[PDB]
């Protein structure tokens, strides 16, 4: 019947005090939770955050909403949530967040005859992810979404992951451009504040940053310009202008690429792994210019040309070896 | 004449339960959807999404709202939408969407004497469609707008593209700045979730990036600068200053282009056709200076040979590289 369900629903809400939680005087109510991640869209290093869209389902028991006679589920219109009690769970890490509201406020309410309520939301959060860029871009990062109840302490509400490790799903639906999710984790614990204890769930992701783009974009121009500087060794010392122009323009190019690539990342005091490599290449080209100047000073300021040739061949055999040693040490240290 | 319609509408709404869908125990309600695409706005590779504007209409049949004696089908004020049940339709690709509110919340409710209800909105969305940039800028794209019922399973609600293939209109009038809509496709299916089976509609556009801008403004600089590097061969080896200046400043210009063209499209791990071409041009300008260094080393340690052989080798090798690149990506 149609009117039977209507009057049953009207009877349910009658006498329902939304201000009081279920089992107000009794033991705490348990609230299982499920998360289905649609996607992790942004991961911004300038802002120290990441965007995350998810279907967030909560499931609890409310004996006040138990009904009989009707033997099937009640999938009610989601405006009914305006006149029902729901847990007040918030994400401690959120910065800007909202419930999607395209064509309707995206919510769902499902009441079962035994009184269990399932409440689903479609949430988007710009969660904060503090991150250490010491090993950037060869960095294995961690981010978290940190759920907690605001109003109710552990004596009034309990949180658990419904389904154990299978509570969080949709990880395969995440395809970030540069990051790859190595493995996720679920944690539950009680956090103590001044007011009192509070239940607290935590979803954690370990991301690995892809490196090939960083290589092709930032790194091999530096090695290329280093070998540009090295080319000055295989030029006759008499042609001073040629070696001068080559070395000085290599140094200029190093400065240009360094200052055009530095702005991308945030203002981080400690030197990143990439900055060490850029400084090393700068030092190498700078030493190439200095040793050429030393050769020029020794020569101009039979016998002297022999010394100049000896220094030139010594540099020729030393610079590639030293640079290869430095490069191998740098790569092995960070891998 | 006027109060009659007033009392009729009042009679329709009193005793109307918005919470319960039409035919609560009966078969599922069939919601016939319809779309008019006003304009596909910008499509940002950086954001990996596209902004869309659309008149979104949906028809269904609520027997509770049946009325007689009024042949004119009523176009009611949008506020009555608060008092009526409507489907819980939503989008999956959306990231930030809104209904326009210019002087009124842009909605329309049209009731018919048989009980049919037409519900129309003017929606603007930012739908996310992931793009494969391996063939960029010579790549095809598939961008889809998908529609679901959030709460009601297939047992309760059912969708269908009203008008069949003609459900979506206005695509032909759209003129994107770079992309070109080669075709659009409508699909209706049933997606099984843990909770149950849900009805799915999908509108998928195939986009082809018109190639008349990047080809002229990106590849041509690099090509001309490689030819510029080749010009150094014809200069005599004795003019060391001219040769090294030309080679090193060609390298400087190439890296300047490389570091100034990074504002085109975002961070992605794999190699791109544009990146492959830039890297080829970079190495081709580099081998000019390298072989010049070999010329100087051999001469001061016969060489005009090194140069002569180079004058025909470098253009031929670059032509082979260009033909391979164009055949592979076209």
């Amino acid at each position, epitope marked *: 019947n149609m009117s039977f369900v209507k009057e049953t629903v009207d009877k349910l809400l009658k006498g329902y005090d939304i201000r009081l939680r279920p089992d107000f005087g009794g033991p705490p109510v348990c609230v299982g939770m499920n998360i289905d991640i649609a996607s992790i869209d942004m991961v911004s290093e300038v802002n120290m955050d990441y965007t995350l869209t998810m279907y967030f389902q909560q499931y609890w028991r409310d004996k006040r909403l138990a009904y009989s006679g009707i033997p099937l589920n009640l999938t009610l219109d989601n405006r009914v949530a305006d006149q029902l009690w729901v847990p007040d769970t918030y994400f401690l890490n959120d910065k800007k967040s909202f419930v999607h509201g395209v064509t309707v406020k995206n919510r769902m309410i499902r009441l079962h005859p035994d009184g269990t309520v399932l409440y689903g939301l479609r949430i988007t959060t710009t969660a904060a992810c503090m991150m250490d860029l010491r090993r950037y871009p060869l960095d294995e990062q961690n981010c978290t979404l940190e759920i907690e109840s605001y109003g109710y302490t552990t004596d009034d509400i309990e949180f658990y992951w419904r389904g154990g490790d299978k509570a969080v*799903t949709g990880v*395969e639906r995440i*395809e970030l451009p540069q990051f*790859s*999710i190595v493995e996720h984790r679920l944690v539950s614990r009680n956090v103590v504040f001044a007011t009192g204890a509070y239940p607290r769930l935590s979803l954690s992701f370990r991301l690995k940053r892809n490196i090939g783009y960083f290589i092709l974009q930032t790194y091999m121009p530096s090695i290329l310009i280093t070998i540009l500087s090295w080319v000055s060794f295989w030029i006759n010392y008499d042609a001073s202008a040629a070696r001068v122009a080559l070395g000085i323009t290599t140094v200029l190019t190093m400065t240009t690429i360094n200052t055009h690539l530095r702005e991308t990342l945030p203002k981080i005091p400690y030197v990143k792994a990439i900055d060490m490599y850029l400084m090393g290449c700068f030092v190498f080209v700078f030493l190439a210019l200095l040793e050429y100047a030393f050769v020029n000073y020794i020569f101009f300021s039979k016998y002297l040309t022999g010394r100049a040739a000896a220094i030139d061949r010594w540099s020729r055999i030393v610079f590639p070896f030293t640079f290869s040693l430095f490069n191998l040490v740098y790569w092995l240290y960070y891998v | 004449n006027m109060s009659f319609v007033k009392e009729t509408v009042d009679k329709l709404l009193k005793g109307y339960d918005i919470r319960l869908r039409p035919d609560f125990g009966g078969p599922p309600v069939c919601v016939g959807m319809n779309i008019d695409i006003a304009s596909i706005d910008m499509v940002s590779e950086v954001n990996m999404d596209y902004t869309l504007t659309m008149y979104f209409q949906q028809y269904w049949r609520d027997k509770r709202l049946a009325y007689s004696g009024i042949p004119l089908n009523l176009t009611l004020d949008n506020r009555v939408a608060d008092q009526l049940w409507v489907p819980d339709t939503y989008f999956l*690709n959306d990231k930030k969407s809104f209904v326009h509110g210019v002087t009124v919340k842009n909605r329309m409710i049209r009731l018919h004497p048989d009980g049919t209800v037409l519900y129309g909105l003017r929606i603007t969305t930012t739908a996310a469609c992931m793009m494969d940039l391996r063939r960029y800028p010579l790549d095809e794209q598939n961008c*889809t707008l998908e529609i679901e019922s959030y709460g009601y399973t297939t047992d309760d609600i059912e969708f269908y593209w009203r008008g069949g293939d003609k459900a979506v209109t206005g695509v032909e009038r759209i003129e994107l700045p770079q992309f070109s809509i080669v075709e659009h496709r409508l699909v209706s299916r049933n997606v099984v979730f843990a909770t149950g089976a849900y009805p799915r509609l999908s509108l998928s556009f195939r986009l082809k990036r018109n190639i008349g801008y990047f080809i002229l403004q990106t590849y041509m600089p690099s090509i001309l600068i490689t030819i510029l590097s080749w010009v150094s061969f014809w200069i005599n080896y004795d003019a060391s200053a001219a040769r090294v200046a030309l080679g090193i400043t060609t390298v400087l210009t190439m890296t300047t282009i490389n570091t100034h063209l990074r504002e085109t499209l975002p961070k992605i791990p794999y190699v791109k056709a544009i990146d492959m071409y830039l890297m080829g041009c970079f190495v081709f300008v580099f081998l000019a200076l390298l072989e010049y260094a070999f010329v100087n080393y051999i001469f001061f340690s016969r060489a005009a040979a090194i140069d002569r052989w180079s004058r025909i080798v470098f253009p031929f090798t670059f032509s082979l590289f260009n033909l391979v690149y164009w055949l592979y990506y076209v």
Partner: nanobody
Amino acid sequence: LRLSCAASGHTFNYPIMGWFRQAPGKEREFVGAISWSGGSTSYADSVKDRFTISRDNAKNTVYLEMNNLKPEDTAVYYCAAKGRYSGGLYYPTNYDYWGQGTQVT
């Protein structure tokens, strides 16, 4: 034992690839799944830390490796592909294309 499932066509549009098995009486069930990138994989409870799924993009292939085989696993195996947005991974209805059943005993 080892099994290989190749892929050709618009593999980008169908990232997730899944493995199912079926006995002559028992119905099709979800054995495992792996994403496009391959960094994320999922397995059923009954095939935890005995099966393995790997992904290689040399020719758009995936490999299923069985360890600690048992007589109850004799069945025909299918390899299928899922769309970008098609819901849960555990239901055969979501997957669109299917590979020819390979018998294993």
